[PDB]
Amino acid sequence: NHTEMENLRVQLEEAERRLENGSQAPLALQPLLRRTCENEMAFLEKQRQDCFKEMKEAIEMVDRLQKKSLKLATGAASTSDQVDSKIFALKSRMEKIHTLTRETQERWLQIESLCGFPLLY
Amino acid sequence: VNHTEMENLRVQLEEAERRLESQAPLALQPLLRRTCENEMAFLEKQRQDCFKEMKEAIEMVDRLQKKSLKLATGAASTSDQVDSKIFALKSRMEKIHTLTRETQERWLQIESLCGFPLL
């Protein structure tokens, strides 16, 4: 009972160390921040999941195009053009997501070290 | 530059003034404000998605009243399954709603352990 326990070990170990330095935040914070940190990484993974899933739809669309009169279409974009810029968007988004998760990991490492206890992964 | 960097500063300087005369290191307040702001944003995007799906559903119900039929096996009709689409959605919206209450509490608690504002 359960991960509550490993938090405790984390806490007890630092309490021992503090009873004997650097930046230290109150030990009551460690479970609250480990939870927070964990929500945040989860939220990122689910964004990464979605972009993957949407990239997979895109691939399927390209498969359809290649498989399957035409008209004029105006001053707009063809469906093929629409798909190519779908991919572009998706790939920029996936880059955005990748840096966001590096930024977030850094932030959490900074928080750890200001706090004086572990929290990441 | 300026922007929210300034506001954080006023938050920090103010508390530094009180501390000079539970405490977390003041350098934490900007990192924690960012973090907290992310979490509420992530939450809101979820509330949005679920709203958007409850809207898709309302649309299905409408299409159903508008518009031949076989035996269908030992399963659920189109209207049966839409009705359960709505049930799931309503539950998700409820879990989403409690989650954001729990999350606010956590941040207030964090605030109080830290000794500075964050929401």
PDB file of N, CA, C and O in Angstrom, chain A residues 32-107:
ATOM      1  N   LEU A  32       2.988  15.174  -3.434  1.00  0.00           N
ATOM      2  CA  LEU A  32       2.147  16.060  -4.222  1.00  0.00           C
ATOM      3  C   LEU A  32       2.790  16.370  -5.576  1.00  0.00           C
ATOM      4  O   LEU A  32       2.129  16.375  -6.614  1.00  0.00           O
ATOM      5  N   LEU A  33       4.091  16.603  -5.557  1.00  0.00           N
ATOM      6  CA  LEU A  33       4.832  16.873  -6.775  1.00  0.00           C
ATOM      7  C   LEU A  33       5.067  15.630  -7.634  1.00  0.00           C
ATOM      8  O   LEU A  33       5.028  15.715  -8.856  1.00  0.00           O
ATOM      9  N   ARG A  34       5.292  14.474  -7.016  1.00  0.00           N
ATOM     10  CA  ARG A  34       5.417  13.250  -7.805  1.00  0.00           C
ATOM     11  C   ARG A  34       4.122  12.938  -8.531  1.00  0.00           C
ATOM     12  O   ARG A  34       4.150  12.469  -9.665  1.00  0.00           O
ATOM     13  N   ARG A  35       2.991  13.195  -7.881  1.00  0.00           N
ATOM     14  CA  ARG A  35       1.695  13.067  -8.545  1.00  0.00           C
ATOM     15  C   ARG A  35       1.618  14.053  -9.740  1.00  0.00           C
ATOM     16  O   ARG A  35       1.377  13.649 -10.885  1.00  0.00           O
ATOM     17  N   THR A  36       1.847  15.340  -9.467  1.00  0.00           N
ATOM     18  CA  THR A  36       1.802  16.396 -10.486  1.00  0.00           C
ATOM     19  C   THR A  36       2.660  16.051 -11.697  1.00  0.00           C
ATOM     20  O   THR A  36       2.196  16.031 -12.835  1.00  0.00           O
ATOM     21  N   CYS A  37       3.930  15.817 -11.430  1.00  0.00           N
ATOM     22  CA  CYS A  37       4.875  15.386 -12.440  1.00  0.00           C
ATOM     23  C   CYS A  37       4.314  14.235 -13.272  1.00  0.00           C
ATOM     24  O   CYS A  37       4.482  14.218 -14.494  1.00  0.00           O
ATOM     25  N   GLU A  38       3.643  13.287 -12.607  1.00  0.00           N
ATOM     26  CA  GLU A  38       3.134  12.075 -13.262  1.00  0.00           C
ATOM     27  C   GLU A  38       1.934  12.370 -14.139  1.00  0.00           C
ATOM     28  O   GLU A  38       1.848  11.860 -15.251  1.00  0.00           O
ATOM     29  N   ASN A  39       1.011  13.195 -13.658  1.00  0.00           N
ATOM     30  CA  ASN A  39      -0.031  13.702 -14.546  1.00  0.00           C
ATOM     31  C   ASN A  39       0.561  14.378 -15.776  1.00  0.00           C
ATOM     32  O   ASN A  39       0.132  14.127 -16.894  1.00  0.00           O
ATOM     33  N   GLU A  40       1.558  15.231 -15.578  1.00  0.00           N
ATOM     34  CA  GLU A  40       2.088  15.989 -16.702  1.00  0.00           C
ATOM     35  C   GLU A  40       2.683  15.107 -17.804  1.00  0.00           C
ATOM     36  O   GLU A  40       2.361  15.281 -18.981  1.00  0.00           O
ATOM     37  N   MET A  41       3.547  14.173 -17.430  1.00  0.00           N
ATOM     38  CA  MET A  41       4.108  13.247 -18.407  1.00  0.00           C
ATOM     39  C   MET A  41       3.026  12.385 -19.074  1.00  0.00           C
ATOM     40  O   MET A  41       3.122  12.084 -20.264  1.00  0.00           O
ATOM     41  N   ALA A  42       1.999  12.000 -18.320  1.00  0.00           N
ATOM     42  CA  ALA A  42       0.894  11.226 -18.892  1.00  0.00           C
ATOM     43  C   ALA A  42       0.210  12.039 -19.975  1.00  0.00           C
ATOM     44  O   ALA A  42       0.059  11.577 -21.103  1.00  0.00           O
ATOM     45  N   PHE A  43      -0.191  13.255 -19.619  1.00  0.00           N
ATOM     46  CA  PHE A  43      -0.793  14.216 -20.547  1.00  0.00           C
ATOM     47  C   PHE A  43       0.017  14.399 -21.838  1.00  0.00           C
ATOM     48  O   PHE A  43      -0.552  14.501 -22.917  1.00  0.00           O
ATOM     49  N   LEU A  44       1.339  14.471 -21.720  1.00  0.00           N
ATOM     50  CA  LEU A  44       2.202  14.543 -22.894  1.00  0.00           C
ATOM     51  C   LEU A  44       2.143  13.268 -23.738  1.00  0.00           C
ATOM     52  O   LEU A  44       2.023  13.331 -24.963  1.00  0.00           O
ATOM     53  N   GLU A  45       2.244  12.115 -23.087  1.00  0.00           N
ATOM     54  CA  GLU A  45       2.210  10.860 -23.810  1.00  0.00           C
ATOM     55  C   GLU A  45       0.916  10.744 -24.625  1.00  0.00           C
ATOM     56  O   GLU A  45       0.943  10.280 -25.763  1.00  0.00           O
ATOM     57  N   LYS A  46      -0.201  11.189 -24.051  1.00  0.00           N
ATOM     58  CA  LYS A  46      -1.487  11.071 -24.719  1.00  0.00           C
ATOM     59  C   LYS A  46      -1.578  11.988 -25.946  1.00  0.00           C
ATOM     60  O   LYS A  46      -2.211  11.639 -26.948  1.00  0.00           O
ATOM     61  N   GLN A  47      -0.947  13.157 -25.862  1.00  0.00           N
ATOM     62  CA  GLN A  47      -0.767  14.046 -27.014  1.00  0.00           C
ATOM     63  C   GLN A  47       0.091  13.381 -28.098  1.00  0.00           C
ATOM     64  O   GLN A  47      -0.245  13.407 -29.279  1.00  0.00           O
ATOM     65  N   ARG A  48       1.203  12.785 -27.688  1.00  0.00           N
ATOM     66  CA  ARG A  48       2.061  12.053 -28.606  1.00  0.00           C
ATOM     67  C   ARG A  48       1.289  10.887 -29.270  1.00  0.00           C
ATOM     68  O   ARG A  48       1.411  10.658 -30.472  1.00  0.00           O
ATOM     69  N   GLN A  49       0.485  10.181 -28.477  1.00  0.00           N
ATOM     70  CA  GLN A  49      -0.377   9.109 -28.961  1.00  0.00           C
ATOM     71  C   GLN A  49      -1.325   9.575 -30.054  1.00  0.00           C
ATOM     72  O   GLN A  49      -1.473   8.917 -31.076  1.00  0.00           O
ATOM     73  N   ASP A  50      -1.976  10.710 -29.817  1.00  0.00           N
ATOM     74  CA  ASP A  50      -2.937  11.301 -30.748  1.00  0.00           C
ATOM     75  C   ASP A  50      -2.317  11.715 -32.077  1.00  0.00           C
ATOM     76  O   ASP A  50      -2.928  11.600 -33.142  1.00  0.00           O
ATOM     77  N   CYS A  51      -1.109  12.235 -32.010  1.00  0.00           N
ATOM     78  CA  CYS A  51      -0.476  12.720 -33.209  1.00  0.00           C
ATOM     79  C   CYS A  51      -0.079  11.499 -34.030  1.00  0.00           C
ATOM     80  O   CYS A  51      -0.259  11.454 -35.243  1.00  0.00           O
ATOM     81  N   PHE A  52       0.455  10.496 -33.351  1.00  0.00           N
ATOM     82  CA  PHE A  52       0.721   9.213 -33.991  1.00  0.00           C
ATOM     83  C   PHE A  52      -0.528   8.691 -34.701  1.00  0.00           C
ATOM     84  O   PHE A  52      -0.493   8.414 -35.896  1.00  0.00           O
ATOM     85  N   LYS A  53      -1.630   8.567 -33.967  1.00  0.00           N
ATOM     86  CA  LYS A  53      -2.878   8.075 -34.540  1.00  0.00           C
ATOM     87  C   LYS A  53      -3.318   8.884 -35.748  1.00  0.00           C
ATOM     88  O   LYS A  53      -3.811   8.321 -36.723  1.00  0.00           O
ATOM     89  N   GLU A  54      -3.126  10.196 -35.695  1.00  0.00           N
ATOM     90  CA  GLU A  54      -3.538  11.067 -36.794  1.00  0.00           C
ATOM     91  C   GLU A  54      -2.570  10.944 -37.970  1.00  0.00           C
ATOM     92  O   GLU A  54      -2.974  11.050 -39.127  1.00  0.00           O
ATOM     93  N   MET A  55      -1.298  10.696 -37.677  1.00  0.00           N
ATOM     94  CA  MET A  55      -0.348  10.382 -38.741  1.00  0.00           C
ATOM     95  C   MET A  55      -0.709   9.068 -39.462  1.00  0.00           C
ATOM     96  O   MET A  55      -0.480   8.916 -40.661  1.00  0.00           O
ATOM     97  N   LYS A  56      -1.292   8.134 -38.725  1.00  0.00           N
ATOM     98  CA  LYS A  56      -1.667   6.848 -39.282  1.00  0.00           C
ATOM     99  C   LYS A  56      -2.868   6.971 -40.221  1.00  0.00           C
ATOM    100  O   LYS A  56      -2.934   6.286 -41.246  1.00  0.00           O
ATOM    101  N   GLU A  57      -3.800   7.855 -39.877  1.00  0.00           N
ATOM    102  CA  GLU A  57      -4.935   8.154 -40.750  1.00  0.00           C
ATOM    103  C   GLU A  57      -4.447   8.755 -42.053  1.00  0.00           C
ATOM    104  O   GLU A  57      -4.939   8.422 -43.131  1.00  0.00           O
ATOM    105  N   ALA A  58      -3.492   9.667 -41.929  1.00  0.00           N
ATOM    106  CA  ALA A  58      -2.865  10.332 -43.063  1.00  0.00           C
ATOM    107  C   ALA A  58      -2.290   9.325 -44.057  1.00  0.00           C
ATOM    108  O   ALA A  58      -2.485   9.449 -45.263  1.00  0.00           O
ATOM    109  N   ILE A  59      -1.562   8.341 -43.539  1.00  0.00           N
ATOM    110  CA  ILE A  59      -0.952   7.297 -44.357  1.00  0.00           C
ATOM    111  C   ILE A  59      -2.012   6.548 -45.147  1.00  0.00           C
ATOM    112  O   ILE A  59      -1.823   6.195 -46.322  1.00  0.00           O
ATOM    113  N   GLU A  60      -3.117   6.283 -44.462  1.00  0.00           N
ATOM    114  CA  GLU A  60      -4.246   5.588 -45.038  1.00  0.00           C
ATOM    115  C   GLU A  60      -4.860   6.424 -46.150  1.00  0.00           C
ATOM    116  O   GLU A  60      -5.295   5.882 -47.167  1.00  0.00           O
ATOM    117  N   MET A  61      -4.886   7.743 -45.963  1.00  0.00           N
ATOM    118  CA  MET A  61      -5.436   8.613 -46.977  1.00  0.00           C
ATOM    119  C   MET A  61      -4.576   8.554 -48.211  1.00  0.00           C
ATOM    120  O   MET A  61      -5.091   8.496 -49.331  1.00  0.00           O
ATOM    121  N   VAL A  62      -3.263   8.570 -48.017  1.00  0.00           N
ATOM    122  CA  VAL A  62      -2.345   8.501 -49.149  1.00  0.00           C
ATOM    123  C   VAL A  62      -2.558   7.198 -49.917  1.00  0.00           C
ATOM    124  O   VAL A  62      -2.520   7.183 -51.153  1.00  0.00           O
ATOM    125  N   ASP A  63      -2.797   6.113 -49.180  1.00  0.00           N
ATOM    126  CA  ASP A  63      -3.120   4.820 -49.785  1.00  0.00           C
ATOM    127  C   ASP A  63      -4.378   4.926 -50.665  1.00  0.00           C
ATOM    128  O   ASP A  63      -4.385   4.459 -51.807  1.00  0.00           O
ATOM    129  N   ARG A  64      -5.427   5.556 -50.137  1.00  0.00           N
ATOM    130  CA  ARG A  64      -6.662   5.807 -50.894  1.00  0.00           C
ATOM    131  C   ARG A  64      -6.422   6.637 -52.137  1.00  0.00           C
ATOM    132  O   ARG A  64      -6.825   6.243 -53.229  1.00  0.00           O
ATOM    133  N   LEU A  65      -5.773   7.785 -51.987  1.00  0.00           N
ATOM    134  CA  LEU A  65      -5.500   8.623 -53.159  1.00  0.00           C
ATOM    135  C   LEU A  65      -4.917   7.779 -54.288  1.00  0.00           C
ATOM    136  O   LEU A  65      -5.492   7.706 -55.374  1.00  0.00           O
ATOM    137  N   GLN A  66      -3.792   7.124 -54.005  1.00  0.00           N
ATOM    138  CA  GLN A  66      -3.058   6.342 -54.997  1.00  0.00           C
ATOM    139  C   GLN A  66      -3.940   5.321 -55.706  1.00  0.00           C
ATOM    140  O   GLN A  66      -3.831   5.128 -56.922  1.00  0.00           O
ATOM    141  N   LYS A  67      -4.805   4.673 -54.929  1.00  0.00           N
ATOM    142  CA  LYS A  67      -5.788   3.726 -55.447  1.00  0.00           C
ATOM    143  C   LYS A  67      -6.752   4.385 -56.441  1.00  0.00           C
ATOM    144  O   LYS A  67      -6.529   4.364 -57.659  1.00  0.00           O
ATOM    145  N   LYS A  68      -7.824   4.969 -55.911  1.00  0.00           N
ATOM    146  CA  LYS A  68      -8.814   5.669 -56.725  1.00  0.00           C
ATOM    147  C   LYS A  68      -8.265   6.996 -57.236  1.00  0.00           C
ATOM    148  O   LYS A  68      -7.417   7.017 -58.128  1.00  0.00           O
ATOM    149  N   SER A  69     -15.508  14.120 -65.093  1.00  0.00           N
ATOM    150  CA  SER A  69     -14.540  13.381 -64.291  1.00  0.00           C
ATOM    151  C   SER A  69     -13.960  14.201 -63.125  1.00  0.00           C
ATOM    152  O   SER A  69     -14.243  13.925 -61.953  1.00  0.00           O
ATOM    153  N   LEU A  70     -13.164  15.216 -63.450  1.00  0.00           N
ATOM    154  CA  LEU A  70     -12.351  15.902 -62.447  1.00  0.00           C
ATOM    155  C   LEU A  70     -12.777  17.343 -62.117  1.00  0.00           C
ATOM    156  O   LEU A  70     -12.698  17.753 -60.960  1.00  0.00           O
ATOM    157  N   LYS A  71     -13.202  18.102 -63.129  1.00  0.00           N
ATOM    158  CA  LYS A  71     -13.648  19.497 -62.958  1.00  0.00           C
ATOM    159  C   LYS A  71     -12.495  20.514 -62.965  1.00  0.00           C
ATOM    160  O   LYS A  71     -11.453  20.268 -63.575  1.00  0.00           O
ATOM    161  N   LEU A  72     -12.690  21.651 -62.291  1.00  0.00           N
ATOM    162  CA  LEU A  72     -11.743  22.777 -62.344  1.00  0.00           C
ATOM    163  C   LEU A  72     -11.126  23.140 -60.987  1.00  0.00           C
ATOM    164  O   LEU A  72      -9.904  23.258 -60.871  1.00  0.00           O
ATOM    165  N   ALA A  73     -11.983  23.361 -59.989  1.00  0.00           N
ATOM    166  CA  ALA A  73     -11.584  23.479 -58.572  1.00  0.00           C
ATOM    167  C   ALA A  73     -11.244  24.878 -58.044  1.00  0.00           C
ATOM    168  O   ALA A  73     -11.161  25.069 -56.827  1.00  0.00           O
ATOM    169  N   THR A  74     -11.035  25.838 -58.946  1.00  0.00           N
ATOM    170  CA  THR A  74     -10.887  27.256 -58.579  1.00  0.00           C
ATOM    171  C   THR A  74      -9.485  27.666 -58.143  1.00  0.00           C
ATOM    172  O   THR A  74      -8.486  27.162 -58.655  1.00  0.00           O
ATOM    173  N   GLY A  75      -9.430  28.603 -57.199  1.00  0.00           N
ATOM    174  CA  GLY A  75      -8.169  29.093 -56.653  1.00  0.00           C
ATOM    175  C   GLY A  75      -7.882  28.431 -55.311  1.00  0.00           C
ATOM    176  O   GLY A  75      -7.472  29.098 -54.359  1.00  0.00           O
ATOM    177  N   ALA A  76      -8.100  27.117 -55.241  1.00  0.00           N
ATOM    178  CA  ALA A  76      -7.943  26.367 -53.995  1.00  0.00           C
ATOM    179  C   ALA A  76      -6.932  25.228 -54.136  1.00  0.00           C
ATOM    180  O   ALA A  76      -6.124  25.218 -55.065  1.00  0.00           O
ATOM    181  N   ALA A  77      -6.982  24.269 -53.213  1.00  0.00           N
ATOM    182  CA  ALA A  77      -6.017  23.171 -53.198  1.00  0.00           C
ATOM    183  C   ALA A  77      -6.658  21.814 -53.483  1.00  0.00           C
ATOM    184  O   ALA A  77      -7.760  21.524 -53.011  1.00  0.00           O
ATOM    185  N   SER A  78      -5.966  20.985 -54.257  1.00  0.00           N
ATOM    186  CA  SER A  78      -6.450  19.638 -54.521  1.00  0.00           C
ATOM    187  C   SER A  78      -6.423  18.773 -53.254  1.00  0.00           C
ATOM    188  O   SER A  78      -5.898  19.173 -52.207  1.00  0.00           O
ATOM    189  N   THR A  79      -7.000  17.585 -53.349  1.00  0.00           N
ATOM    190  CA  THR A  79      -7.131  16.746 -52.181  1.00  0.00           C
ATOM    191  C   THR A  79      -5.744  16.219 -51.834  1.00  0.00           C
ATOM    192  O   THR A  79      -5.418  16.009 -50.665  1.00  0.00           O
ATOM    193  N   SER A  80      -4.936  16.038 -52.877  1.00  0.00           N
ATOM    194  CA  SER A  80      -3.553  15.616 -52.750  1.00  0.00           C
ATOM    195  C   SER A  80      -2.735  16.689 -52.052  1.00  0.00           C
ATOM    196  O   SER A  80      -1.907  16.385 -51.185  1.00  0.00           O
ATOM    197  N   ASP A  81      -2.962  17.940 -52.437  1.00  0.00           N
ATOM    198  CA  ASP A  81      -2.351  19.072 -51.751  1.00  0.00           C
ATOM    199  C   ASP A  81      -2.838  19.144 -50.307  1.00  0.00           C
ATOM    200  O   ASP A  81      -2.056  19.401 -49.381  1.00  0.00           O
ATOM    201  N   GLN A  82      -4.131  18.901 -50.115  1.00  0.00           N
ATOM    202  CA  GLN A  82      -4.695  18.915 -48.773  1.00  0.00           C
ATOM    203  C   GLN A  82      -4.021  17.883 -47.877  1.00  0.00           C
ATOM    204  O   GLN A  82      -3.797  18.124 -46.697  1.00  0.00           O
ATOM    205  N   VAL A  83      -3.694  16.731 -48.446  1.00  0.00           N
ATOM    206  CA  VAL A  83      -3.115  15.654 -47.667  1.00  0.00           C
ATOM    207  C   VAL A  83      -1.654  15.962 -47.357  1.00  0.00           C
ATOM    208  O   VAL A  83      -1.178  15.714 -46.247  1.00  0.00           O
ATOM    209  N   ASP A  84      -0.946  16.521 -48.332  1.00  0.00           N
ATOM    210  CA  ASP A  84       0.464  16.821 -48.136  1.00  0.00           C
ATOM    211  C   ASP A  84       0.649  17.853 -47.020  1.00  0.00           C
ATOM    212  O   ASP A  84       1.608  17.785 -46.247  1.00  0.00           O
ATOM    213  N   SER A  85      -0.279  18.800 -46.927  1.00  0.00           N
ATOM    214  CA  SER A  85      -0.209  19.812 -45.874  1.00  0.00           C
ATOM    215  C   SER A  85      -0.818  19.329 -44.555  1.00  0.00           C
ATOM    216  O   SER A  85      -0.559  19.902 -43.504  1.00  0.00           O
ATOM    217  N   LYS A  86      -1.614  18.269 -44.614  1.00  0.00           N
ATOM    218  CA  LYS A  86      -2.037  17.562 -43.411  1.00  0.00           C
ATOM    219  C   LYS A  86      -0.800  16.942 -42.753  1.00  0.00           C
ATOM    220  O   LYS A  86      -0.564  17.075 -41.545  1.00  0.00           O
ATOM    221  N   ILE A  87      -0.008  16.269 -43.574  1.00  0.00           N
ATOM    222  CA  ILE A  87       1.212  15.639 -43.108  1.00  0.00           C
ATOM    223  C   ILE A  87       2.169  16.668 -42.520  1.00  0.00           C
ATOM    224  O   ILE A  87       2.746  16.452 -41.453  1.00  0.00           O
ATOM    225  N   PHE A  88       2.313  17.795 -43.209  1.00  0.00           N
ATOM    226  CA  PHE A  88       3.221  18.842 -42.767  1.00  0.00           C
ATOM    227  C   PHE A  88       2.826  19.343 -41.381  1.00  0.00           C
ATOM    228  O   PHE A  88       3.663  19.436 -40.473  1.00  0.00           O
ATOM    229  N   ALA A  89       1.547  19.672 -41.237  1.00  0.00           N
ATOM    230  CA  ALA A  89       0.997  20.079 -39.955  1.00  0.00           C
ATOM    231  C   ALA A  89       1.314  19.031 -38.893  1.00  0.00           C
ATOM    232  O   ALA A  89       1.906  19.340 -37.856  1.00  0.00           O
ATOM    233  N   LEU A  90       0.944  17.785 -39.167  1.00  0.00           N
ATOM    234  CA  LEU A  90       1.148  16.717 -38.199  1.00  0.00           C
ATOM    235  C   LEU A  90       2.597  16.611 -37.786  1.00  0.00           C
ATOM    236  O   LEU A  90       2.904  16.466 -36.604  1.00  0.00           O
ATOM    237  N   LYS A  91       3.500  16.694 -38.750  1.00  0.00           N
ATOM    238  CA  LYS A  91       4.920  16.593 -38.424  1.00  0.00           C
ATOM    239  C   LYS A  91       5.482  17.786 -37.641  1.00  0.00           C
ATOM    240  O   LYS A  91       6.414  17.625 -36.861  1.00  0.00           O
ATOM    241  N   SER A  92       4.931  18.981 -37.861  1.00  0.00           N
ATOM    242  CA  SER A  92       5.338  20.144 -37.076  1.00  0.00           C
ATOM    243  C   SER A  92       4.839  19.975 -35.653  1.00  0.00           C
ATOM    244  O   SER A  92       5.567  20.220 -34.697  1.00  0.00           O
ATOM    245  N   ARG A  93       3.589  19.544 -35.527  1.00  0.00           N
ATOM    246  CA  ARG A  93       2.999  19.249 -34.232  1.00  0.00           C
ATOM    247  C   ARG A  93       3.818  18.220 -33.455  1.00  0.00           C
ATOM    248  O   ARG A  93       4.043  18.371 -32.257  1.00  0.00           O
ATOM    249  N   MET A  94       4.266  17.170 -34.140  1.00  0.00           N
ATOM    250  CA  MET A  94       5.042  16.133 -33.484  1.00  0.00           C
ATOM    251  C   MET A  94       6.398  16.683 -33.009  1.00  0.00           C
ATOM    252  O   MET A  94       6.940  16.245 -31.996  1.00  0.00           O
ATOM    253  N   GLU A  95       6.939  17.656 -33.731  1.00  0.00           N
ATOM    254  CA  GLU A  95       8.173  18.304 -33.299  1.00  0.00           C
ATOM    255  C   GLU A  95       7.888  19.151 -32.060  1.00  0.00           C
ATOM    256  O   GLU A  95       8.601  19.076 -31.055  1.00  0.00           O
ATOM    257  N   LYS A  96       6.833  19.949 -32.147  1.00  0.00           N
ATOM    258  CA  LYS A  96       6.352  20.728 -31.028  1.00  0.00           C
ATOM    259  C   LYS A  96       6.263  19.824 -29.798  1.00  0.00           C
ATOM    260  O   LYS A  96       6.838  20.118 -28.732  1.00  0.00           O
ATOM    261  N   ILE A  97       5.566  18.702 -29.950  1.00  0.00           N
ATOM    262  CA  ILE A  97       5.422  17.776 -28.836  1.00  0.00           C
ATOM    263  C   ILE A  97       6.782  17.298 -28.339  1.00  0.00           C
ATOM    264  O   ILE A  97       6.975  17.158 -27.151  1.00  0.00           O
ATOM    265  N   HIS A  98       7.733  17.054 -29.232  1.00  0.00           N
ATOM    266  CA  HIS A  98       9.005  16.506 -28.775  1.00  0.00           C
ATOM    267  C   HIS A  98       9.776  17.497 -27.935  1.00  0.00           C
ATOM    268  O   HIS A  98      10.339  17.126 -26.913  1.00  0.00           O
ATOM    269  N   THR A  99       9.793  18.757 -28.351  1.00  0.00           N
ATOM    270  CA  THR A  99      10.512  19.753 -27.583  1.00  0.00           C
ATOM    271  C   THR A  99       9.764  20.026 -26.278  1.00  0.00           C
ATOM    272  O   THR A  99      10.381  20.106 -25.218  1.00  0.00           O
ATOM    273  N   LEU A 100       8.440  20.127 -26.342  1.00  0.00           N
ATOM    274  CA  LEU A 100       7.650  20.305 -25.122  1.00  0.00           C
ATOM    275  C   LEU A 100       8.026  19.268 -24.066  1.00  0.00           C
ATOM    276  O   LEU A 100       8.104  19.582 -22.877  1.00  0.00           O
ATOM    277  N   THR A 101       8.258  18.026 -24.482  1.00  0.00           N
ATOM    278  CA  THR A 101       8.565  17.006 -23.486  1.00  0.00           C
ATOM    279  C   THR A 101      10.017  17.053 -23.000  1.00  0.00           C
ATOM    280  O   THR A 101      10.313  16.612 -21.899  1.00  0.00           O
ATOM    281  N   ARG A 102      10.919  17.607 -23.804  1.00  0.00           N
ATOM    282  CA  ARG A 102      12.266  17.878 -23.314  1.00  0.00           C
ATOM    283  C   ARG A 102      12.253  19.054 -22.327  1.00  0.00           C
ATOM    284  O   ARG A 102      12.814  18.960 -21.242  1.00  0.00           O
ATOM    285  N   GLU A 103      11.593  20.147 -22.699  1.00  0.00           N
ATOM    286  CA  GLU A 103      11.406  21.286 -21.800  1.00  0.00           C
ATOM    287  C   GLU A 103      10.827  20.862 -20.450  1.00  0.00           C
ATOM    288  O   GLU A 103      11.248  21.352 -19.405  1.00  0.00           O
ATOM    289  N   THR A 104       9.851  19.959 -20.484  1.00  0.00           N
ATOM    290  CA  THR A 104       9.125  19.571 -19.288  1.00  0.00           C
ATOM    291  C   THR A 104      10.011  18.702 -18.406  1.00  0.00           C
ATOM    292  O   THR A 104       9.976  18.812 -17.180  1.00  0.00           O
ATOM    293  N   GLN A 105      10.829  17.858 -19.028  1.00  0.00           N
ATOM    294  CA  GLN A 105      11.751  17.016 -18.271  1.00  0.00           C
ATOM    295  C   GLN A 105      12.775  17.889 -17.561  1.00  0.00           C
ATOM    296  O   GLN A 105      13.115  17.639 -16.405  1.00  0.00           O
ATOM    297  N   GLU A 106      13.269  18.909 -18.260  1.00  0.00           N
ATOM    298  CA  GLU A 106      14.228  19.829 -17.673  1.00  0.00           C
ATOM    299  C   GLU A 106      13.614  20.492 -16.444  1.00  0.00           C
ATOM    300  O   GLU A 106      14.198  20.479 -15.355  1.00  0.00           O
ATOM    301  N   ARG A 107      12.426  21.059 -16.631  1.00  0.00           N
ATOM    302  CA  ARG A 107      11.733  21.760 -15.565  1.00  0.00           C
ATOM    303  C   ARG A 107      11.630  20.865 -14.334  1.00  0.00           C
ATOM    304  O   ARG A 107      11.917  21.295 -13.226  1.00  0.00           O
TER     305      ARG A 107
END
